[PDB]
Short mmCIF file of all heavy atoms in Angstrom, two decimals:
data_model
loop_
_atom_site.label_atom_id
_atom_site.label_comp_id
_atom_site.label_asym_id
_atom_site.label_seq_id
_atom_site.Cartn_x
_atom_site.Cartn_y
_atom_site.Cartn_z
N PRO A 6 60.90 87.25 124.01
CA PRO A 6 62.28 86.89 123.66
C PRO A 6 62.97 87.89 122.75
O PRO A 6 62.35 88.57 121.92
CB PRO A 6 62.14 85.53 122.96
CG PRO A 6 60.70 85.43 122.55
CD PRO A 6 59.93 86.23 123.54
N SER A 7 64.30 87.99 122.93
CA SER A 7 65.19 88.77 122.07
C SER A 7 66.39 87.91 121.67
O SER A 7 67.55 88.26 121.90
CB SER A 7 65.69 90.05 122.75
OG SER A 7 64.64 90.85 123.27
N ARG A 8 66.10 86.77 121.04
CA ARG A 8 67.15 85.80 120.74
C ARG A 8 68.08 86.29 119.65
O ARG A 8 69.29 86.04 119.72
CB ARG A 8 66.54 84.45 120.33
CG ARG A 8 65.97 83.67 121.53
CD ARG A 8 65.08 82.47 121.14
NE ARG A 8 64.04 82.23 122.15
CZ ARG A 8 62.73 82.09 121.90
NH1 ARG A 8 62.26 82.11 120.66
NH2 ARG A 8 61.87 81.91 122.90
N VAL A 9 67.56 86.97 118.62
CA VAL A 9 68.45 87.41 117.55
C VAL A 9 69.46 88.43 118.08
O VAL A 9 70.65 88.37 117.74
CB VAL A 9 67.66 87.95 116.34
CG1 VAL A 9 68.61 88.39 115.27
CG2 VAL A 9 66.74 86.89 115.77
N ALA A 10 69.02 89.36 118.94
CA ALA A 10 69.93 90.35 119.51
C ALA A 10 71.11 89.72 120.24
O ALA A 10 72.19 90.34 120.31
CB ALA A 10 69.20 91.26 120.50
N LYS A 11 70.90 88.55 120.85
CA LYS A 11 71.93 87.94 121.71
C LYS A 11 72.83 86.95 120.97
O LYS A 11 73.71 86.38 121.61
CB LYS A 11 71.28 87.24 122.92
CG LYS A 11 70.40 88.14 123.81
CD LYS A 11 71.08 89.43 124.27
CE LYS A 11 71.99 89.21 125.46
NZ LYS A 11 72.80 90.41 125.79
N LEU A 12 72.63 86.72 119.68
CA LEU A 12 73.56 85.87 118.96
C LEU A 12 74.98 86.46 119.03
O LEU A 12 75.14 87.69 118.96
CB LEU A 12 73.16 85.71 117.51
CG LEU A 12 71.83 85.02 117.20
CD1 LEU A 12 71.53 85.09 115.73
CD2 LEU A 12 71.83 83.57 117.64
N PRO A 13 76.02 85.62 119.15
CA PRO A 13 77.38 86.17 119.25
C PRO A 13 77.79 87.06 118.09
O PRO A 13 78.55 88.02 118.30
CB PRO A 13 78.25 84.90 119.31
CG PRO A 13 77.40 83.90 119.98
CD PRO A 13 75.99 84.18 119.46
N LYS A 14 77.38 86.75 116.86
CA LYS A 14 77.75 87.58 115.72
C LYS A 14 77.21 89.01 115.80
O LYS A 14 77.64 89.86 115.00
CB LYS A 14 77.29 86.92 114.42
CG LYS A 14 75.79 86.85 114.23
CD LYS A 14 75.45 86.32 112.83
CE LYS A 14 73.95 86.13 112.67
NZ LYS A 14 73.51 86.03 111.24
N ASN A 15 76.30 89.32 116.73
CA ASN A 15 75.70 90.64 116.81
C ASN A 15 76.19 91.42 118.02
O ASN A 15 75.67 92.51 118.30
CB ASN A 15 74.16 90.52 116.82
CG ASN A 15 73.60 90.07 115.49
OD1 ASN A 15 74.15 90.39 114.42
ND2 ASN A 15 72.49 89.31 115.53
N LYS A 16 77.22 90.94 118.73
CA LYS A 16 77.65 91.62 119.93
C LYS A 16 78.09 93.06 119.65
O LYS A 16 77.83 93.96 120.45
CB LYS A 16 78.80 90.85 120.60
CG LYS A 16 79.09 91.25 122.04
CD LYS A 16 79.81 90.14 122.82
CE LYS A 16 80.09 90.53 124.27
NZ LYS A 16 80.77 89.44 125.04
N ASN A 17 78.79 93.29 118.54
CA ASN A 17 79.24 94.65 118.26
C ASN A 17 78.20 95.48 117.52
O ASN A 17 78.53 96.56 117.03
CB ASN A 17 80.56 94.64 117.46
CG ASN A 17 80.38 94.31 116.00
OD1 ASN A 17 79.39 93.70 115.58
ND2 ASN A 17 81.35 94.73 115.19
N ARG A 18 76.95 95.01 117.45
CA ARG A 18 75.84 95.79 116.92
C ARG A 18 74.95 96.34 118.03
O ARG A 18 73.99 97.08 117.74
CB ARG A 18 75.01 94.94 115.95
CG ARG A 18 75.75 94.65 114.64
CD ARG A 18 74.97 93.84 113.62
NE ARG A 18 75.77 93.55 112.43
CZ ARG A 18 75.31 93.48 111.19
NH1 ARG A 18 74.04 93.71 110.90
NH2 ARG A 18 76.14 93.19 110.21
N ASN A 19 75.28 96.03 119.28
CA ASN A 19 74.52 96.48 120.45
C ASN A 19 75.39 97.39 121.30
O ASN A 19 76.51 97.04 121.64
CB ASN A 19 74.04 95.28 121.26
CG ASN A 19 73.03 94.44 120.51
OD1 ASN A 19 72.04 94.97 119.95
ND2 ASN A 19 73.27 93.14 120.46
N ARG A 20 74.84 98.55 121.68
CA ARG A 20 75.56 99.49 122.53
C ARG A 20 75.55 99.05 123.99
O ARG A 20 76.56 99.21 124.68
CB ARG A 20 74.95 100.89 122.38
CG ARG A 20 75.63 102.00 123.17
CD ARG A 20 74.93 103.36 122.85
NE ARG A 20 75.29 103.81 121.51
CZ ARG A 20 76.46 104.34 121.22
NH1 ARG A 20 77.36 104.50 122.18
NH2 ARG A 20 76.74 104.72 119.99
N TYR A 21 74.43 98.51 124.47
CA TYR A 21 74.28 98.11 125.87
C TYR A 21 73.77 96.68 125.91
O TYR A 21 72.88 96.30 125.14
CB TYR A 21 73.32 99.06 126.63
CG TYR A 21 73.68 100.53 126.63
CD1 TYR A 21 72.98 101.45 125.83
CD2 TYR A 21 74.71 101.03 127.44
CE1 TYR A 21 73.30 102.78 125.83
CE2 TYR A 21 75.03 102.39 127.45
CZ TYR A 21 74.32 103.26 126.64
OH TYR A 21 74.66 104.61 126.65
N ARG A 22 74.35 95.84 126.79
CA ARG A 22 73.99 94.42 126.81
C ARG A 22 72.58 94.17 127.36
O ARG A 22 71.99 93.14 127.05
CB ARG A 22 75.01 93.61 127.62
CG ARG A 22 75.18 94.08 129.03
CD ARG A 22 75.62 92.94 129.96
NE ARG A 22 75.86 93.40 131.33
CZ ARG A 22 74.90 93.77 132.17
NH1 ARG A 22 73.63 93.77 131.80
NH2 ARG A 22 75.22 94.17 133.40
N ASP A 23 72.05 95.10 128.16
CA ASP A 23 70.72 94.95 128.74
C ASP A 23 69.63 95.74 128.01
O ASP A 23 68.54 95.90 128.56
CB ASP A 23 70.75 95.36 130.21
CG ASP A 23 71.22 96.78 130.40
OD1 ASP A 23 71.97 97.27 129.52
OD2 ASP A 23 70.86 97.39 131.42
N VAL A 24 69.89 96.22 126.79
CA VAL A 24 68.86 96.88 125.97
C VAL A 24 68.84 96.23 124.60
O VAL A 24 69.75 96.44 123.80
CB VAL A 24 69.07 98.39 125.85
CG1 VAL A 24 67.94 99.05 125.00
CG2 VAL A 24 69.13 99.04 127.23
N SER A 25 67.80 95.45 124.32
CA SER A 25 67.68 94.65 123.12
C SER A 25 66.28 94.75 122.55
O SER A 25 65.30 94.81 123.31
CB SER A 25 67.99 93.17 123.41
OG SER A 25 69.28 93.04 123.95
N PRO A 26 66.14 94.73 121.23
CA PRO A 26 64.81 94.64 120.62
C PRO A 26 64.23 93.24 120.76
O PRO A 26 64.93 92.24 120.56
CB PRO A 26 65.08 94.95 119.14
CG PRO A 26 66.52 94.40 118.92
CD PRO A 26 67.23 94.69 120.22
N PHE A 27 62.92 93.16 121.03
CA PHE A 27 62.19 91.89 120.97
C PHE A 27 62.22 91.34 119.56
O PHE A 27 62.13 92.09 118.58
CB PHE A 27 60.73 92.06 121.41
CG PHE A 27 60.54 92.54 122.80
CD1 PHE A 27 59.55 93.47 123.08
CD2 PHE A 27 61.31 92.05 123.86
CE1 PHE A 27 59.33 93.90 124.39
CE2 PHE A 27 61.09 92.51 125.17
CZ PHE A 27 60.09 93.43 125.41
N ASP A 28 62.27 90.00 119.46
CA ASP A 28 62.22 89.35 118.14
C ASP A 28 60.96 89.73 117.35
O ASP A 28 61.01 89.89 116.14
CB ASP A 28 62.31 87.82 118.27
CG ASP A 28 63.66 87.35 118.81
OD1 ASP A 28 64.70 87.95 118.44
OD2 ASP A 28 63.68 86.39 119.62
N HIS A 29 59.80 89.82 118.02
CA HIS A 29 58.55 89.92 117.26
C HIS A 29 58.39 91.29 116.61
O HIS A 29 57.70 91.40 115.60
CB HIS A 29 57.34 89.58 118.16
CG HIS A 29 56.90 90.68 119.07
ND1 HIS A 29 56.02 91.66 118.67
CD2 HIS A 29 57.16 90.92 120.38
CE1 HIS A 29 55.79 92.48 119.68
NE2 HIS A 29 56.48 92.06 120.73
#
């Protein structure tokens, strides 16, 4: 899972929607 990356408040902290760090 990468739940923290997908929180709405973090949308402008991600360059690409399909590249996210794993939570662990």
Side-chain angles (χ1 to χ4, degrees):
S7 308
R8 285 167 211 129
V9 180
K11 303 308 279 172
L12 297 173
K14 67 174 175 162
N15 290 328
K16 196 157 181 179
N17 77 338
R18 290 182 183 215
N19 294 310
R20 182 177 287 283
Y21 303 105
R22 57 152 177 71
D23 58 334
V24 181
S25 302
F27 299 140
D28 294 322
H29 79 86

